[PDB]
Every structure is written in C-alpha cells, then in structure tokens.
Amino acid sequence: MRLLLFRQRNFRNLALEAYRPPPGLSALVGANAQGKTSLLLGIHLALGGEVPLGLADLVRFGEEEAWLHAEVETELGAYRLEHRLGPGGREVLLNGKRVSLRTLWELPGSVLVSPLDLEAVLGPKEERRAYLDRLIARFSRRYAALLSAYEKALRQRNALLKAGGEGLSAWDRELARYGDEIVALRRRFLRRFAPILREVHAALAAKEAGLRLEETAGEGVLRALEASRAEERERGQTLVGPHRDDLVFLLEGRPAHRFASRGEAKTLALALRLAEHRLLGEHHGEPPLLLVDEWGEELDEARRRAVLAYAQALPQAILAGLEAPPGVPVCSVVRGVVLCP
C-alpha cells in the first residue's frame, strides 16, 4: 500500500492543500501535537477508518462540511478515495463513484494507533463489543452484512415484545439464523487474533495479554431465547444473542478494565492495534498503512524498539511524536501545513 497524496478542506484544525508522504517510514514533527493528531486521523478516515466524533469535532469551527481525499497505490491498482463529512452524513467516493463506506475495506486501508484507543480497554462493556464488531467487519463482508440483518430482526422482535405477548416465533428463527453465524464468525476470528495479541504484547510488556468473549447464547440463540422467555417478557427486550455478549481483555488472567493502570491499558491498546495490523496484512496480502500517534510520549527503549522495529519493516508507515526516531526522514507540521524537506 502506498499513500501518494492526501488532501483536505476544513477537517479539524488542518490547512494543508496537499501532503505527499514518502515511501517507507517517516515522521511528523512540530510543536503542535493536535495538528499532527488531526493529520493522522484525517488520513485514517480518508482510507476508510471510523472514529467516535461529533461533526463539530470533525469539521472546522464555523464551517459546514469537511472534505478528505487520498490517492493510493495497492496490489489491486490505483484508487482515489474521497469523503465529504457534513450535516447529511459521510459521503464516500471511490474512483469517482459513490460507494458504501465498507467498500473501502476491500483495500488494505490503514491502522491508527490513537490516543482514543485506551478508552475501549478501560471503558464499558458496550464499547468493547462495538470495537469487536468494527474489527471483524474490516475482514469480512459477510460479517458486516450479518450485523445489518441481525439488527433488523432484533429491532422487529423487540417491537413485538414491547407490544404485548406477540407471534415472536418467526423472529426467533431469524435472530438465530443471523445470530448463530455471528457467534461462529467471532469464535473463528478470535482463534486467529488472540495468539497474535499475546505475541505482540509480549514484545511490549511483561504481563501476558489475553481475551475472552463471554456468550449469552453459546449453545444457540433459539435455546437461549427459550430459557429467557419469561424474563424477556418481564423486561420488554431480547436478553440473549451476540448483541449482549461481552469481550473481556485480560492481563495476567485478570480483567483489564478493572486491574490495568492507564499505562498498562495504553500498551494493551497498542498491542491490539499492531495485532490488527498484522492480521490485516495476512488477510489482504499487503500491509495496511500504519499510522502511529504519540510516538514520543513516555516510552521506554524496549517498547520503542519493538514498535519502531515493526513499523520500519513495512512498505510505508508514518509516526507522529514530539521527537522522531533518529535517521527517520522527517516532515514538519506548522500552522496546519506539512513541509517534507
């Protein structure tokens, strides 16, 4: 994957007209860390990323819409990716054609190591499950399509529930059809991803990292629905199925959301991103672009070496921090504009 060109208008605090990163590994330097963080985030979204931000935190103050453009070369060919972010939503174009966002996940895209990442490790149940669904959807168009179909069957089913004792029967079978498949795909995915997470985290930290997906309907959605029938009737809501399952991250066998320090969480989050990156490379046959924010933060030598060692072996990667690694080509960001000397 080679990002050839990034252009933007009215995205966060950026002013650049164009940014042309070099091939290989490069670093963004400058006093304004927020500018760098926005640049990396703009690139990530240009390439098909998603992040949790109100429009006033994606679009420049006093402006209506933002635009993002990326020109990439991939194993699949050359592509022009564009996004308009405004009151109407996110409009995505690929080579001049309006496409669903998920279409861009047909290409390798990017992985961003962001300051936002630790909050999932530390945050509520629903956020870890949301992370899981976004992750797997990158890999599997069937999974993305099952999420949509399940969410319809669920919506329709809870409506029949809220409206008394209804004819739930056909809804049970639909929820199970989509749900059982989602459960299966999650198990398959996590069998591949968990060992990668453990390996990657071992290079960054002393504590063993793990994960567990706790299922409400592990013997099948139909059978769990039966067993929850009185109780779901009592609450007005489906209580079992993959929308209720919990992804737990572990350090030394113990839940990270309870027993990780913020620093430990930040390193676990880093490992999760690098494991996602590795697995995407296997899936696509070509690595995503890797974008690393906070390169310079309170890093230790071995942690740095391990990430630098990973990033410097890719076709292209961009780091942003207070200082660049020595010998890494550097581009300055000053007043929203990049200069690559």
Does 316 appear as a known binding residue?
no
3-state DSSP assignment of residue 82: strand
Beta strands 110-113 and 289-293: pairing type? Answer: parallel
Is there a binding annotation on residue 237?
no
Does the annotation flag 267 for ligand binding? no
121-133 CB burial, b ≥16 within 10 A, e <16: bbeeeebbbebbb
34 is in an annotated binding site: yes
Q: How is the chain split into domains, by residue range?
A: 1-115+289-341, 116-288
Judge whether 117 and 273 are in contact, CB under 8 Å.
yes
CA distance 220 to 232: 17
In terms of DSSP bridges, do strands 316-320 and 24-29 run parallel, antiparallel, or are they unpaired? parallel
Q: How far is CA 139 from CA 18, 26, 72, 250, in A?
A: 30, 27, 19, 23
36 is in an annotated binding site: yes
46 annotated to a ligand binding site: no
Residue 315 has a CB neighbour count (10 Å cut-off) of 17
- Contact criterion met (CB below 8 Å) for 333 and 32: yes
The answer to whether 207 is annotated as binding is no
Method underlying the structure: X-ray
Can you read off the two tokens belonging to residue 133? 């669904």
- The whole-angstrom separation of Cα 130 and Cα 120 is 9
Judge whether 30 is annotated as a binding position.
Answer: yes
Taking domain 116-288, whether its CATH number is 1.20.140.160 is answered by: no
